[PDB]
Structure formats: structure tokens, C-alpha cells
Design a protein around this ligand. Structure first.
Ligand SMILES: *[C@@H]1O[C@H](CO)[C@@H](O[C@H]2O[C@H](CO)[C@@H](O[C@@H]3O[C@H](CO[C@@H]4O[C@H](CO)[C@@H](O)[C@H](O)[C@@H]4O)[C@@H](O)[C@H](O[C@@H]4O[C@H](CO)[C@@H](O)[C@H](O)[C@@H]4O)[C@@H]3O)[C@H](O)[C@H]2NC(C)=O)[C@H](O)[C@H]1NC(C)=O
Ligand SMILES: *[C@@H]1O[C@H](CO)[C@@H](O[C@@H]2O[C@H](CO)[C@@H](O[C@@H]3O[C@H](CO)[C@@H](O)[C@H](O)[C@@H]3O)[C@H](O)[C@H]2NC(C)=O)[C@H](O)[C@H]1NC(C)=O
Ligand SMILES: *[C@H]1O[C@H](CO)[C@@H](O[C@H]2O[C@H](CO)[C@@H](O)[C@H](O)[C@H]2NC(C)=O)[C@H](O)[C@H]1NC(C)=O
Ligand code: NAG
Length: 326
């Protein structure tokens, strides 16, 4: 007699019992693999006497979990909400993912784990470090603060801050490291020789306290006119009063700050400490002029040896200042 051959292998199905051949009368059963369903309902067949399995209308397709394209305030990386695909989630900035970051479409046709949700990241109101007060804070959400919000602290009078004065509301619901408010004092500043110094009239001096200096006519300051009590208990700087220099020569064109000037004119009232200048002097041989420097260093200034000061009443030898450059 005849016999039916092995059954055609249908997509996403299972046949039972699956033999390579059947006797007329035997029965087999197609079933969609788990995670699939059929536009039909599980087809069974009995091997005909002809030995030819009938036409199979069985079509199995993936069960489809519920639409999950939208994630309020977030992104949903997906392909097709059908078994056994995986879909992942994430939230826009400001929000955190309250739930699993991904989920699969189970063979049952539901999402596992249950779809997550994006939620607003928040920090509770911040604390005030000792000896400080924050003047930059206002709840953005209820009694609390939202992501990347800020609060700014300013220490208390006579107290120095250590660490940024500004804190932000991090993704961890907590704020960034807080600043410190220690109290700092500075010793009184020493008066400068040939000069004087001033500062608040009180028992002790603390952080951010100002002290000003100066010098008697003959001298000038070699440091800033004003200084303050730094957070490290010492001062901005300690200026001294340095002696000015009398004009080195009677008449001469010199370079002061890259420009030519009449030295007797520029420093009519003497040169201050530090003032630098450049003298001109020719190079006999090549008949051109070059320049060397000099500077007022506390009452003294070394005019270059190469310099030659021609007298006003002589003039008859051209000045180095007027010789072509070298
Ligand atoms: C805001 O809120 C956060 C809570 O979520 C909080 O936590 C974060 O910051 C803390 C530290 O402040 C973190 O804990 C530390 O993590 C360090 C880095 O992690 C390591 O992990 C890697 C794994 O990849 C290992 O390879 C490393 O060896 C290491 O273990 C870690 O080094 C710290 O460990 C210590 O090391 C010390 C060294 O001398 C030891 O004394 C000490 O005993 C310990 O061994 C510590 O674990 C925490 O994980 C962070 N968590 C998150 C989610 O960010 C923040 O601190 C908080 N911010 C503020 C300002 O409060
Ligand atoms: C006010 O007082 C503080 C307290 O000492 C002074 O801090 C000192 O600052 C210097 C640099 O400005 C630090 O030097 C550091 O180490 C060596 C110096 O040989 C070198 O690697 C670098 O110069 C480096 O910056 C020094 O460590 C630091 N003092 C201490 C104890 O740590 C500050 O300079 C004073 N300010 C004024 C205006 O006087
Ligand atoms: C945030 O905290 C405030 C506290 O200022 C709460 O305000 C009041 O209203 C509540 C009503 O449920 C009371 O139960 C609180 O006792 C009362 N607070 C004070 C100080 O009297 C407010 O409810 C909180 N708001 C949110 C959104 O959490
Ligand atoms: C600290 O505050 C922020 C960073 O947190 C930034 O402005 C800078 O790094 C610091 N600002 C100041 C004023 O030190």
C-alpha cells in the first residue's frame, strides 16, 4: 500500500508525532511554536489512502505584546512589539527611569518586566553649612529642587569659604559637595620704611579686611596700594616704599615702553622705582645706533656706558638717538 511521507516543515510550527512516513489512517498535529499563534487554530491531518498529505493552511505568527512606542518623557528603542523581541527604555534629561531599562515580549504575549516609567529627578532642599547662609535657592518642584538646579552659599562675616560657593542638584537626588565657612584672622600689616600703612581700628583683623599703603614723596610702592586678609590668614601682599631715581642725564631721547620719549620730559619729576628705559648710542664702525637698557632700582640707575650725552651747546655732533638703526 501507499504511505504519507514526512510532513512539510511549516514556519514556527511543530508536528506530532513526527515520523519520516505514515500509514494511511495515522494522524499528525501541527501546532505553532510557543510565542506564536495561527490564523487557524492548530491543524490536524490524517494520512490519506492516496499517500498525499492535504494542503496546509496553517500560518503561525508571533504573538504581539501591547503597543509600547511611547514612553512619556523618554525614548523607546524598538523594532516590533511582537514575540520575542526586546524593547529598551531611557528618559530625557531631568528624568530618571523608574523601572527596568528593557523588556521582552514573552511567549505569553505580555511585557516582562512590566513597562517602566520616566520620573522627574529631584533633590530635597539643601542644608546650610555652619557659619553660612544661602541666598540663591527656590524650590522648583513642590518643596523640592529639580535636576541641575543650583544653590549658592556665602559664608558669614569674618569667615572664609572653602570649596565652590555653588551646589547643583545631581542625578542622585543629592547635592554636590558643600562649602566650608571657617573664621580667619590676619596679623596687622607692618608699616613700610619711607612710607605708611592703614587698616581698620579694631582688636583683630579678619578675612577680606583691607589695608592700604603709601610712600613719602621721595619713594613709591613696589607692590599694590591695597591689600586684604586672605583666607589663609596672611595678606594679599606686603608692598615696600622704594626710592625713586633722579634723572640720570641732562638731556636724552630714550625708549620708554617701546616708544621714544625725551627722558628729561617723561620723568621730569624723577623716575619711579622699577621704571625701565633704553638709551641710544652709535656703533662708530657701521655708523648706526643700537640701544641698551637701564632701570631705576631703589634710587639707583645705571646709564649704559655706551651712552654718550652730547651737550645742548655743542650740537654739532649728531646724537646717537638720531643715527639710523643698526
Ligand atoms: C550623592 O549620592 C550618591 C549615592 O548614590 C553618593 O555615592 C556615590 O559616591 C560614593 C563616594 O562618595 C561612591 O562610593 C565610593 O565609590 C568609589 C568608586 O567606586 C569603586 O568601584 C570600582 C568598581 O568599578 C572599583 O574598581 C574601585 O576599586 C572602587 O571600589 C570607591 O572608591 C569608594 O570606596 C572606598 O575607598 C576608600 C579609599 O581609601 C576606603 O577608605 C573606603 O573604605 C572604601 O573602600 C566608595 O565606594 C558611590 O559608589 C557613588 N554612587 C553613585 C550611584 O554615584 C555620592 O557620594 C553622593 N555625593 C555626595 C556629595 O554626597
Ligand atoms: C600666604 O600664605 C600661604 C601659606 O603658606 C602661602 O602658600 C604657599 O604658596 C606657595 C606658592 O604660592 C606654595 O608653594 C608650593 O610648593 C613649592 C614651593 O617651593 C612649589 O612646588 C610651588 O611653589 C607650589 O605652589 C606653598 O606650598 C604654600 N605654603 C604652604 C605652607 O603650603 C601663600 O603663598 C601666601 N601668600 C602670600 C601673598 O604671601
Ligand atoms: C512640603 O512641605 C510643606 C511644609 O512647609 C508642607 O506644607 C504644609 O501642608 C501639609 C499638608 O499635607 C501639612 O501636612 C504640613 O504640616 C504643612 N507644613 C507646615 C510647615 O506647616 C507641604 O505639604 C509639602 N508639600 C509637598 C508637595 O510635599
Ligand atoms: C565652581 O562652580 C561651578 C562648577 O560647580 C563653576 O562655575 C566653576 O567650576 C566654579 N566656580 C567658581 C566661581 O569657583
Amino acid at each position: 500500500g501507499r504511505t504519507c511521507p514526512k510532513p512539510d516543515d511549516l514556519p514556527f510550527s511543530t508536528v506530532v508525532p513526527l515520523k519520516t512516513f505514515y500509514e494511511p489512517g495515522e494522524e499528525i498535529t501541527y501546532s505553532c511554536k510557543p510565542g506564536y499563534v495561527s490564523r487557524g487554530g492548530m491543524r490536524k491531518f490524517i494520512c490519506p489512502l492516496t499517500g498525499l498529505w492535504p494542503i496546509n493552511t496553517l500560518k503561525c505568527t508571533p504573538r504581539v505584546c501591547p503597543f509600547a512606542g511611547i514612553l512619556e518623557n523618554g525614548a523607546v528603542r524598538y523594532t516590533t512589539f511582537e514575540y520575542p523581541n526586546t524593547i529598551s527604555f531611557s528618559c530625557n534629561t531631568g528624568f530618571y527611569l523608574n523601572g527596568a531599562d528593557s523588556a521582552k515580549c514573552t511567549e505569553e504575549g505580555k511585557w516582562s518586566p512590566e513597562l517602566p516609567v520616566c520620573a522627574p529627578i529631584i533633590c530635597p532642599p539643601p542644608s546650610i553649612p555652619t557659619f553660612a547662609t544661602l541666598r540663591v535657592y527656590k524650590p522648583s518642584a513642590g518643596n523640592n529642587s529639580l535636576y541641575r538646579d543650583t544653590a549658592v552659599f556665602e559664608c558669614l562675616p569674618q569667615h572664609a569659604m572653602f570649596g565652590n560657593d555653588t551646589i547643583t542638584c545631581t542625578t542622585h537626588g543629592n547635592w554636590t559637595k558643600l562649602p566650608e565657612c571657617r573664621e580667619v584672622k590676619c596679623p596687622f600689616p607692618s608699616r613700610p620704611d619711607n612710607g605708611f600703612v592703614n587698616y581698620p581700628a579694631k582688636p583683630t583683623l579678619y578675612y577680606k579686611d583691607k589695608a592700604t599703603f603709601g610712600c613719602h614723596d621721595g619713594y613709591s610702592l613696589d607692590g599694590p596700594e591695597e591689600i586684604e586678609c586672605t583666607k589663609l590668614g596672611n595678606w594679599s601682599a606686603m608692598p615696600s616704599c622704594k626710592a625713586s631715581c633722579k634723572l640720570p642725564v641732562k638731556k636724552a631721547t630714550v625708549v620708554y615702553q617701546g616708544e621714544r620719549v625725551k627722558i628729561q620730559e617723561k620723568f621730569k619729576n624723577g623716575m619711579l622705582h622699577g621704571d625701565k628705559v633704553s638709551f641710544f648710542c652709535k656703533n662708530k664702525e657701521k655708523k648706526c645706533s643700537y640701544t641698551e637698557d637701564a632701570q631705576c632700582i631703589d634710587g639707583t640707575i645705571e646709564v649704559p656706558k655706551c651712552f654718550k650725552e652730547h651737550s645742548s651747546l655743542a650740537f654739532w655732533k649728531t646724537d646717537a638717538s638720531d643715527v639710523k638703526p643698526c
